[PDB]
Structures are given as C-alpha cells and as structure tokens.
Design a protein around this nucleic acid. Structure first.
Ligand code: K
Ligand code: K
Ligand code: K
Ligand code: K
Ligand code: K
Ligand code: K
Ligand code: K
Ligand code: K
Ligand code: K
Ligand code: K
Ligand code: K
Ligand code: K
Ligand code: K
Ligand code: K
Ligand code: K
Ligand code: MG
Ligand code: MG
Ligand code: MG
Ligand code: MG
Ligand code: MG
Ligand code: MG
Ligand code: MG
Ligand code: MG
Ligand code: MG
Ligand code: MG
Ligand code: MG
Ligand code: MG
Ligand code: MG
Ligand code: MG
Ligand code: MG
Ligand code: MG
Ligand code: MG
Ligand code: MG
Ligand code: MG
Ligand code: MG
Ligand code: MG
Ligand code: MG
Ligand code: MG
Ligand code: MG
Ligand code: MG
Ligand code: MG
Ligand code: MG
Ligand code: MG
Ligand code: MG
Ligand code: MG
Ligand code: MG
Ligand code: MG
Ligand code: MG
Ligand code: MG
Ligand code: MG
Ligand code: MG
Ligand code: MG
Ligand code: MG
Ligand code: MG
Ligand code: MG
Ligand code: MG
Ligand code: MG
Ligand code: MG
Ligand code: MG
Ligand code: MG
Ligand code: MG
Ligand code: MG
Ligand code: MG
Ligand code: MG
Ligand code: MG
Ligand code: MG
Ligand code: MG
Ligand code: MG
Ligand code: MG
Ligand code: MG
Ligand code: MG
Ligand code: MG
Ligand code: MG
Ligand code: MG
Ligand code: MG
Ligand code: MG
Ligand code: MG
Ligand code: MG
Ligand code: MG
Ligand code: MG
Ligand code: MG
Ligand code: MG
Ligand code: MG
Ligand code: MG
Ligand code: MG
Ligand code: MG
Ligand code: MG
Ligand code: MG
Ligand code: MG
Ligand code: MG
Ligand code: MG
Ligand code: MG
Ligand code: MG
Ligand code: MG
Ligand code: MG
Ligand code: MG
Ligand code: MG
Ligand code: MG
Ligand code: MG
Ligand code: MG
Ligand code: MG
Ligand code: MG
Ligand code: MG
Ligand code: MG
Ligand code: MG
Ligand code: MG
Ligand code: MG
Ligand code: MG
Ligand code: MG
Ligand code: MG
Lengths: 138, 124
RNA sequence: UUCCCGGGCCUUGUACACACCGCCCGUCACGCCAUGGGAGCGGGCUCUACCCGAAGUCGCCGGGAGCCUACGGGCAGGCGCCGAGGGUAGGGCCCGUGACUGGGGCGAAGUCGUAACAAGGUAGCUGUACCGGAAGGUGCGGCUGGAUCACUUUCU
RNA sequence: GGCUAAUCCCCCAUGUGGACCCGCCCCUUGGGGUGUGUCCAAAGGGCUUUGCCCGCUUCCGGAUGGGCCCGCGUCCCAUCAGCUAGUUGGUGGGGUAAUGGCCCACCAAGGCGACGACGGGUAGCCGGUCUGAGAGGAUGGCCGGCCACAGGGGCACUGAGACACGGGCCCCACUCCUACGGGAGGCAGCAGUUAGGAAUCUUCCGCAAUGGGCGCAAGCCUGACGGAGCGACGCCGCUUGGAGGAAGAAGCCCUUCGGGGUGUAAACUCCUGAACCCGGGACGAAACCCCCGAGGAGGGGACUGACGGUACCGGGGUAAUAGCGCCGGCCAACUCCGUGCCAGCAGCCGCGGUAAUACGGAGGGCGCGAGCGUUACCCGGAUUCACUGGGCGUAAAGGGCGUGUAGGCGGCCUGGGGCGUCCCAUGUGAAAGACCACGGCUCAACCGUGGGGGAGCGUGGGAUACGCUCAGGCUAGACGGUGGGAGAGGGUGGUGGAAUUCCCGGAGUAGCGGUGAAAUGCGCAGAUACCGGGAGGAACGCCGAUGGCGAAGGCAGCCACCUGGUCCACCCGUGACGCUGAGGCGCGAAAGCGUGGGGAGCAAACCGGAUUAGAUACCCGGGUAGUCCACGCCCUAAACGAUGCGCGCUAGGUCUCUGGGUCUCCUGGGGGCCGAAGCUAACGCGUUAAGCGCGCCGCCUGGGGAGUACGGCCGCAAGGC
C-alpha cells in the first residue's frame, strides 16, 4: 500500500515535471486537495480538478512551465525546481511560531498544517500559529 | 540507516589512542638513561644517529633521540624527555630535551637556540 | 610466412610504468621488538557453610551476691540478639612471576625453488578433505573477477 | 568520703491551651471542629526599682531552613545474561519529627531484566567553562548550588539540629612518651616542612570594612575576610624616545667589479621627560555607643584606617631592557660560504652521495613582542559516527534463505475525545557569567548599575488540519469464492532404455591399451575387436534452449500417489484484516562425521610409469576413503544478479515463456536484449533501477596484523558463530 500519500503525490508531481508532462493523476483526498489549493494559490501549477478514473476518484493536476529556451537542451526551466517532504512516518516535524523556517530568503514557500488548517509559512506567521511542516517547495 | 535504528543502537563515538605513553597527560617525563647507542635508519635514508635507552619515573623504559651536533651522555645520566616522534628511526616515540639535567645544550649554535637549549652567546 | 631475429597496423588481457633482463609468494637462516598458552610459586578480591567475636544500641535478669529509694523504681553489674574484625574449608575472579612453548610484525638481505599478474606456462578464485622442505599440489562442488575461431622449458 | 548556691534536677497546685483513648460532625489517606475521662506548664535576673528592660512557660500562625516519596534526564564494555533471599508483598510489632523491609517475628512467592538487569571499567553532579556557523563535542579548576569524606573500618550519646574535620567509644596501621603495667597523637583548616613529581607561594599585616558566635552594653573571639608579598601562570594597560638628518659614513654581506645591500638606520642638531628626588596626602567611615526626645520616629555630638606615606595631585628631573620563532611546498620571507647518504633537519610530502633557497654559519628578510617557540591535552578543519550532514553493483559494507514474536510504520469518508502537536496567560528558570546601554578607577582589563533575554517543565484556558484513540461506514491495498493454466517445485513407491565394468558361452589372432614421444599395465590361464546370455550399480542422450519452477540451497528418463507455491479471467464474498521484521525456529550446495547397507564408473591419500636440474605436480597405468541409499550430525561458500523486502511514480523499441481477448493486435504476469529522461567517480544502471520517493531489517567507518589470540556458546570429532 501507499506509505505516505502526500509524499506519493509530491513525488508524482516531481516526476511529471521532469518529463514535462501535461497533467498528472493523484488519488483523491481532502488533505491532498488542500495542499494543491496552496500550490495553486502561489502559482506553482496551472490548477487542478476532480476527475474519475475507472470506478475510482482522482485529482488531475495540471503542471506549469516557462518559455522555450535557447541553445542545446531546449527543455524549459522548471517552475518547480525542488520539492521535498519534511515530516515523515517515523519522524514527525513540528515547528512553533518562532520555529517556522523561511524558504530561500522568501523566494520560496513552506507548507504547514495547523488547527486553523493548512497554511503557508507567511500565513502561519501572520496568524501566529505553529503546526506540522509538510514539505518545502521552491 | 533508519531513524529507529539510530534510536536503538545510535552512533558510535570514535576514541583516540595516545602516541605518548608517558601517561598522566604528561608534558614531559624525567628518566635515567640505560645505554647510549647509534641506530641504523630504514630504507629511505642512511646515517649514524644517536639514540638512548631510558628508564622512566613513570615506570616505562623507552628509546629517545638525541638532537644536536654533539652531546655528552653516560650510562647513569639524568635526562628529561618530551613528546614527538622520529619517523626515519622506528621504535623511538620520544625526544630528549637538551639543556636540562645531565644533558648539556649544544655548543656554538647561534641560529636557533631555543629547541636545542643553548644560552645567548656573549656580545660583540 | 609454420617456426627463429628485428619491426609496423588493429585488437585483447595486465597486480608491469627505470616498463617481462618487469613484478611478486613462502619455508628456513640472520638482525630487532611486542604478544598468547602455560605447570608451578606469591599476592589481592569476592561468595557460601561453620566457628571465635571488641565497642555500642536494643532485649531479659536485676533475686536473703552490691548501691540510692518517697518502696513506686533507678543505677551498677550480669546474660543475650545484632555486629567491625578474625579463622577454617570450599568455589570463583582479578593481579605478579614463571621453566617450557605457539605464532606474529619490522629490518640488512642470504638460502631452496616459480606459486600469483599476459592462456604467468596445468585459467584463476573458492569452501572443504588429504598429502607434501615451502610457495603449494590434487579430489568434490561452486563462482566470472577466464583468455582464445578451433611435451617440457628456472632466475635477473 | 563530706559541706553548698542557682535560669541545674524534682514534687504539688493553677488548664487560656495542648497531648491520648473512645464517640459524633464536617472534610477525605494521619485535615479540622467538638464532648466526657486522663495527663502536662514554668525562672528568675538587672535596673536610672515599686515601673520598665532582659529572659522564662504553654498554644496557634508566619518567616527561614530541611527531611521523605514520585515522573523525567544522567559515561564506557553484550568476549558481563540471567540477577535477587529481608530479596518482593502482606499481617502484627519495634524504631523515628515523619513514610519505608530502617529493625524484628509469622505467612505467602514473589521482585528485577535486551526499553540493557546483575557484573566489570571509569567518574562528585550542576549553574557554567572551552570550542564550533549551527547542531554538537569535550570539560566540571577558580566563583556559586547541592552531595560525599575528615588516617582505614564501625557505633552510639548529647541535643532543635550530627552518626560530629579541631567531641566520645572500640578494632586496624603508623608516629611519639613509657618506670613496659600503660597512655598520647590525626594540617583533605592558615602558613610552613617532608616525600612524590615536569610543577604550583609568605611559618606575612590587620578586626579599620564586610560577615559570623556570645553579650543589655562596653566588648571579646574570628588564617571567614579585608590586604600585602612571591611566580610574565592568564588578561589588560605602558615604556625602551620624538622630530630634523647624505643618492646614502664606516664596518659587514653580495657583486656581471660598473655597483648594490644593511638604511634615516646610526652618528650628530634640537625637543619632550618612563624611571627616580621632594611637597601635600584620600575615598573606603558611620554606625554600634552617648545626649535630646519615649530605650520608637526624628535630631545632634563623639571614637575608630590593616592596606599606608600607598592610590592620586603639585614641583624638580636623566635618551634610558630587545628579544624570540621562521625563511622548499602547505606558508609570508633568499643569497654567499661550509659540509659531501657524513654531520644532521622534520608536523606531512621529504632534504643531504661537490657547487643543498630544506643541514651548519653569515648577510638579508618575514612573523610577533615583554614575550617567543616546543611538548602534552581539548574542540576544530571533520559532512571522517553525517538529526541538521554519509554510505553498502566492482573502493570498506546486504545478513545464505524463509517463517514469524516484540517493536516500528498506517488506504478513503463522517463524528466524539483533545494523549501527541499548536496558541494565550501564569509559576519556575537564583546570583555571578554570557548579550545590549550607561557609568567608576587618567582608558582598558576589572568592577558597578540598569536593560534584554532564554530552552525545559508545572498549572489554567483555547484551537482540531496532521498523528493517536474510540464510534460508524466505503472498497483502489490484502484475503477469499468460482472457472481455467503452466511448470526439472517437494516427498513416497514402482518402472524403462542406452552405455561402462564383471561373470558365462560362441566365434577369432598377435597384440591391445595409452602419449609430445614412450613405458608401467593387460594378453598363450587366449585379451583388444565381434556376437549371444546373465549380474549389478549409478546417471538420465536426442527433446533442451538465449527455456521453465522454487524464498534461498537447488531441481532433468517415465508411471502412480501424497503435497506446496503461483499466474489469468468472472467483480461474486469479507472489509484495512497491511508492510517490515531484533531475538526465536525451520530449511540450508559440495566436502566432512556417526551407525548400517551398497559399491559399475569415477577418484584425495596412496602403489607405480614417464618428463625434469629436482617433480612430493601437470601426462600415463592402478587403486582406499568417498561418491550412492536409510537415519542422525556437521551451518560453511565467489549461498553471486558481488544489487534485503514491500509499494507508488517516471519514453519506448526488440526477443521470448505463459494466461485472456472483438486474436494484423490489445492486455495481465514472468524471463532477456538496445536504450528517453534521470542517476553514476567511471564502467555502467535504466518499468526486472543502481532513477524519483516512503516504511522497516541487516551492515560499513584506512591497510597489515587477523577472520588470528583469548572468552563464551553449539558440536562426537574436524570446526563454526
Ligand atoms: K590500411
Ligand atoms: K582491471
Ligand atoms: K537488691
Ligand atoms: K478539658
Ligand atoms: K545579639
Ligand atoms: K538614632
Ligand atoms: K640611545
Ligand atoms: K646534487
Ligand atoms: K639556506
Ligand atoms: K638554513
Ligand atoms: K585533532
Ligand atoms: K557475505
Ligand atoms: K535457467
Ligand atoms: K555521463
Ligand atoms: K563447525
Ligand atoms: Mg637518504
Ligand atoms: Mg606530535
Ligand atoms: Mg615477431
Ligand atoms: Mg602501415
Ligand atoms: Mg592499445
Ligand atoms: Mg620469463
Ligand atoms: Mg556470636
Ligand atoms: Mg554487648
Ligand atoms: Mg546494661
Ligand atoms: Mg606473563
Ligand atoms: Mg599455479
Ligand atoms: Mg595453480
Ligand atoms: Mg606459473
Ligand atoms: Mg593438466
Ligand atoms: Mg596456472
Ligand atoms: Mg588466473
Ligand atoms: Mg582447493
Ligand atoms: Mg598428491
Ligand atoms: Mg573444479
Ligand atoms: Mg561526693
Ligand atoms: Mg480547659
Ligand atoms: Mg477538650
Ligand atoms: Mg498538674
Ligand atoms: Mg533489607
Ligand atoms: Mg506500622
Ligand atoms: Mg509510624
Ligand atoms: Mg576518582
Ligand atoms: Mg568524587
Ligand atoms: Mg563542524
Ligand atoms: Mg559561539
Ligand atoms: Mg585547590
Ligand atoms: Mg593524611
Ligand atoms: Mg543547643
Ligand atoms: Mg556529616
Ligand atoms: Mg565538630
Ligand atoms: Mg587538623
Ligand atoms: Mg624531586
Ligand atoms: Mg570585625
Ligand atoms: Mg561586626
Ligand atoms: Mg654603508
Ligand atoms: Mg630618529
Ligand atoms: Mg616638567
Ligand atoms: Mg631639558
Ligand atoms: Mg535620655
Ligand atoms: Mg541618630
Ligand atoms: Mg612565500
Ligand atoms: Mg659531517
Ligand atoms: Mg630546523
Ligand atoms: Mg654547496
Ligand atoms: Mg622548513
Ligand atoms: Mg563533526
Ligand atoms: Mg542520515
Ligand atoms: Mg563515505
Ligand atoms: Mg567489496
Ligand atoms: Mg543475499
Ligand atoms: Mg515476514
Ligand atoms: Mg507483528
Ligand atoms: Mg493515516
Ligand atoms: Mg499502531
Ligand atoms: Mg492533548
Ligand atoms: Mg512562559
Ligand atoms: Mg540567570
Ligand atoms: Mg568610562
Ligand atoms: Mg547585569
Ligand atoms: Mg495546559
Ligand atoms: Mg472538535
Ligand atoms: Mg473501523
Ligand atoms: Mg483451481
Ligand atoms: Mg518433480
Ligand atoms: Mg562388483
Ligand atoms: Mg572357446
Ligand atoms: Mg607381460
Ligand atoms: Mg599356452
Ligand atoms: Mg571384452
Ligand atoms: Mg519466480
Ligand atoms: Mg544459483
Ligand atoms: Mg464486490
Ligand atoms: Mg459491503
Ligand atoms: Mg549440509
Ligand atoms: Mg555429502
Ligand atoms: Mg558416512
Ligand atoms: Mg562404510
Ligand atoms: Mg624419477
Ligand atoms: Mg591418476
Ligand atoms: Mg582409473
Ligand atoms: Mg511480454
Ligand atoms: Mg515485461
Ligand atoms: Mg521488456
Ligand atoms: Mg541499457
Ligand atoms: Mg543521457
Ligand atoms: Mg567514461
Ligand atoms: Mg562483520
Ligand atoms: Mg589501525
Ligand atoms: Mg585496525
Ligand atoms: Mg575459520
């Protein structure tokens, strides 16, 4: 079975982005959908939608890329350069308000989860709430 | 390794063995000489070098090199020794400080006196 | 153009790079250190059983063998449990010395040989078994870390 | 033995009150209230004496300090695995301020332990210190907090408080006195001595300040302390001069013999004036006390300075210690001479055997400075034990494989709880130190003030996304049903053919065999070759492969029986029932061992023949164990795909095994090859990952020594872990 559905999703995204695929399918969940909402708000993706494959619910995530480039290796620059899960099964990463990191000098974002719901780093900073650190994306 | 493995077994702290068994964190050691010899060096070089068998107040008995152009060392001579080794002469883990006890400093060395234990010569 | 000598091109293998007149293995002999087993003899600790057991609390006696008494008792003294310590026997551990003896490392390079790196000359490695001055040899099986289309013959 | 006073001891009364038994009420472990019964108090002294001061007795409470219990954290060795016997618990007693198995009887058999017990080694712990970007590592001296000890071992008294450093008792060692019967002594208190050692101080000044004990007070005591001295031991501050000075003295060192270098450096000129000589001389010191007032508040007066004639102020006033390491590269600074694998240097790579920028000296230069190097130790660089922050296809490292215990991890939706997690408030987080600001000694060091913080935990409250738990539900994971399929998967029993060897028979003759070439060997007791018959063992040619099965080892004629694993289809059933897996257990090639049987071929050892300098080998002729079967052991390997298992995602092309299908082709599972992206140090890997990620197990930290020594466990042994 899937050990970490989150990590599964994010890794699928990494893969699909590496091959410059159009969109990608991920198993449906509220958590995942919210994380993708955060991902869409900051514009790391074109967007998402709820779809149905076979007899099972899924989520279509449409990736996002840049303009065509010059010289050898025409492949465009990744909008998402690096994305990695932080909290894991067997090791849980929990940060307080003053423990909340800052990604790439503000050039990138951090996805957290609080009692007020799934938030970004600056959102959790302004609301002044700590929680589980899900992953880092820049 | 997995995190749980580090929870159980954990990392191992590397130790360090002393290259100077004068024990007692010893900066130096006082000892009485046994013999005074000349030891042939290993393959890389060829020479006649002056070493000595020294019994120590620590109870140890070890070989020690004798720096300087010349020296005076008898059988029962009293000698203070210091750390540091001699590579071209295997088996010698210690150095002999000159200018201390029965070991006199080298005569007429005007460049570096400190390590060879010579006093400042008279003025011009 | 099979073979002897010199040489060239392509390829293949190499643990060679003062470059096969190369590198490299081991027994034994010589030089120098450290170490194991270890009878035996000293020393230390600990454990059990038994025995001896000071001081001191606690406990009993404290009586026509002692002292004070308001007769209610108290002190002295006596006995006893524990007990520091000591002894015996047995068991175990550590530590010193130790005849004899096992192997090792380094170095100076001698000795018998050619083991391994080119198919290193019987491809090698290997676990195991046996044998042999030594490297090793061979049997069973396994591995590709094996070349290639398909007499023998040392060393520098 | 005798006299005697008291805040010494005792007896009686006084019962504000308290103590104890029993009862009741409230509260909830032994807290409080209350009733009867019983029991308990005591000290006087001085006065400026008939009124105050000091002190006493009982009770309650505060303040301070402390005892005991508990949660959590607290080094190394698993070659220490079982440990415990008042040990674990209970009843009743003893003891204490109080719980306790602290102590003692009786009963029960419990208690601890891979989450590391017990044992061994090591070590006072902490606030902090050092280092480091950080995490962390190391350390625990000075100051401060707690603990433990007071020559070694043990025990009680006194008392609020000790199991008592300058108190007591005994045992032991040592020293001293002894009239030999016996006693005295305890610097890990200050200083000082001795011994050890590389090494650490004056047998100092003082009660002025601070603090402590007693006292109404005056005051006494105080090696606590305040000071001084010694030691570049550390940090900081400062001086050895400042300026004017020739293309540039001498001396010395290089030299193309022209010159260059030391270098404005020095002489000299001028100026300033550390040291020293005088004069003045401090803060730290105003309280206790006395006077007024009231012995309060308030006010007033007086005494007291170890440091010390020192800090400092004012005047006078001399140009007056520089040394140490290094100079090949790391690493900044170069030449001459000497030396000749000599003498020697060295932290690493290394230098030196005739012209050495590495040794020695000289000139010069660089670094630092009242200091400069060496040794030892700690962190660092070192991401080289990697949480941040590493690895295991060939460099070190995948466990031989499976099963599965503990443990670790958890598919989709709804709800409750709020343990984790997050937020607010509060308590703690002492002082010093560290950070910031101001200030005091001429600055700094140092000191002062104030400010700023802080993880961790306690308490109260709030949040519910994730983790957790409970309640319920879904079906993509997994299991199962039904219907099909392949396969050397494994066990038992039976059976078939070819061939080798031996026996029997027929026929048949001069050799066969074997090598590079020969010989040993077999043959006239008739072989080799041919035919027929019989015996027996062991292995299964073609099919057959780049093939298939199994978890690994491994599995190959065929029949039957017993039995495991596995693929596909039908969406049928259960409803997260899952993944991993320390230890344990089972399996485990070949060799080897034990017992028994069997033995054709093969073949270690061995018996021989050739070859060779030798041949204990390769070649050849024989031939035992063994190879085989039954049972019981042995646990090893290049047990290798040198790649642990499970899942998800990430171009394809080509060959193949097998299952299904509307069967050019699509699909599901398995085995190969070339290869997108990507990864890799390269080779190479590449939907069978070594790519992108997750969960869990095992394992690695330079080579040799050595998979050895010793220990333990397993085995009959060899040996293995
Ligand atoms: K050509
Ligand atoms: K190679
Ligand atoms: K009597
Ligand atoms: K009463
Ligand atoms: K007082
Ligand atoms: K007053
Ligand atoms: K001068
Ligand atoms: K030379
Ligand atoms: K030089
Ligand atoms: K030099
Ligand atoms: K270091
Ligand atoms: K292995
Ligand atoms: K196969
Ligand atoms: K590449
Ligand atoms: K074994
Ligand atoms: Mg040499
Ligand atoms: Mg050294
Ligand atoms: Mg030729
Ligand atoms: Mg040509
Ligand atoms: Mg070539
Ligand atoms: Mg040759
Ligand atoms: Mg007794
Ligand atoms: Mg007694
Ligand atoms: Mg008595
Ligand atoms: Mg010995
Ligand atoms: Mg060979
Ligand atoms: Mg060989
Ligand atoms: Mg050879
Ligand atoms: Mg051969
Ligand atoms: Mg060979
Ligand atoms: Mg070979
Ligand atoms: Mg072999
Ligand atoms: Mg042989
Ligand atoms: Mg073989
Ligand atoms: Mg009397
Ligand atoms: Mg009353
Ligand atoms: Mg009453
Ligand atoms: Mg009374
Ligand atoms: Mg007890
Ligand atoms: Mg009781
Ligand atoms: Mg009690
Ligand atoms: Mg100690
Ligand atoms: Mg201690
Ligand atoms: Mg670091
Ligand atoms: Mg720091
Ligand atoms: Mg001290
Ligand atoms: Mg003493
Ligand atoms: Mg008292
Ligand atoms: Mg005490
Ligand atoms: Mg005392
Ligand atoms: Mg004393
Ligand atoms: Mg001495
Ligand atoms: Mg005083
Ligand atoms: Mg005072
Ligand atoms: Mg000049
Ligand atoms: Mg001048
Ligand atoms: Mg003046
Ligand atoms: Mg003047
Ligand atoms: Mg008056
Ligand atoms: Mg006053
Ligand atoms: Mg330089
Ligand atoms: Mg010489
Ligand atoms: Mg030098
Ligand atoms: Mg020269
Ligand atoms: Mg140097
Ligand atoms: Mg580190
Ligand atoms: Mg890691
Ligand atoms: Mg590494
Ligand atoms: Mg390897
Ligand atoms: Mg394996
Ligand atoms: Mg399993
Ligand atoms: Mg389980
Ligand atoms: Mg979950
Ligand atoms: Mg769970
Ligand atoms: Mg909670
Ligand atoms: Mg707080
Ligand atoms: Mg503080
Ligand atoms: Mg200031
Ligand atoms: Mg402060
Ligand atoms: Mg709370
Ligand atoms: Mg809620
Ligand atoms: Mg449920
Ligand atoms: Mg079926
Ligand atoms: Mg079969
Ligand atoms: Mg037979
Ligand atoms: Mg016949
Ligand atoms: Mg014959
Ligand atoms: Mg005949
Ligand atoms: Mg025949
Ligand atoms: Mg398979
Ligand atoms: Mg295999
Ligand atoms: Mg269904
Ligand atoms: Mg259902
Ligand atoms: Mg076996
Ligand atoms: Mg066998
Ligand atoms: Mg057998
Ligand atoms: Mg037999
Ligand atoms: Mg012969
Ligand atoms: Mg043979
Ligand atoms: Mg044969
Ligand atoms: Mg296929
Ligand atoms: Mg396939
Ligand atoms: Mg394929
Ligand atoms: Mg490929
Ligand atoms: Mg590429
Ligand atoms: Mg390449
Ligand atoms: Mg190992
Ligand atoms: Mg080593
Ligand atoms: Mg080693
Ligand atoms: Mg072995």
């Amino acid at each position: 079975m899937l050990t970490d559905p989150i990590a599964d999703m994010l890794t699928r995204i990494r893969n699909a982005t590496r091959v410059y695929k159009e969109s990608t399918d991920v198993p449906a969940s509220r958590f995942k959908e919210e994380i993708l909402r955060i991902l869409a708000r900051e514009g790391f993706i074109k967007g998402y939608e709820r779809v149905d494959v076979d007899g099972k619910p899924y989520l279509r995530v449409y990736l996002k890329y840049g303009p065509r480039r010059q010289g050898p290796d025409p492949r465009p620059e990744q909008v998402i350069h690096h994305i990695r899960r932080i909290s894991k099964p067997g090791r849980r990463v929990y940060v307080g308000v003053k423990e909340i990191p800052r990604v790439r000098r503000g050039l990138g974002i951090a996805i957290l989860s609080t009692s007020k719901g799934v938030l970004t780093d600056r959102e959790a900073r302004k609301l002044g709430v700590g929680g589980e650190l899900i992953c880092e994306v820049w | 390794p997995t995190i749980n493995q580090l929870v159980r077994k954990g990392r191992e702290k590397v130790r360090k063995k002393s290259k100077v068994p004068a024990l007692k964190g010893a900066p130096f050691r006082r000892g009485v000489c046994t013999v005074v010899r000349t030891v042939t060096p290993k393959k890389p070089n060829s020479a006649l070098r002056k070493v000595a068998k020294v019994r120590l107040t620590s109870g140890y008995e070890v070989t020690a090199y004798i720096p300087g152009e010349g020296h005076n060392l008898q059988e029962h001579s009293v000698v203070l020794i210091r750390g540091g080794r001699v590579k071209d002469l295997p088996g010698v883990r210690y150095h002999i400080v000159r200018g201390v006890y029965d070991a006199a400093g080298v005569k007429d060395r005007k460049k570096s006196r400190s390590k060879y234990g010579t006093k400042k010569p008279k003025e011009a």
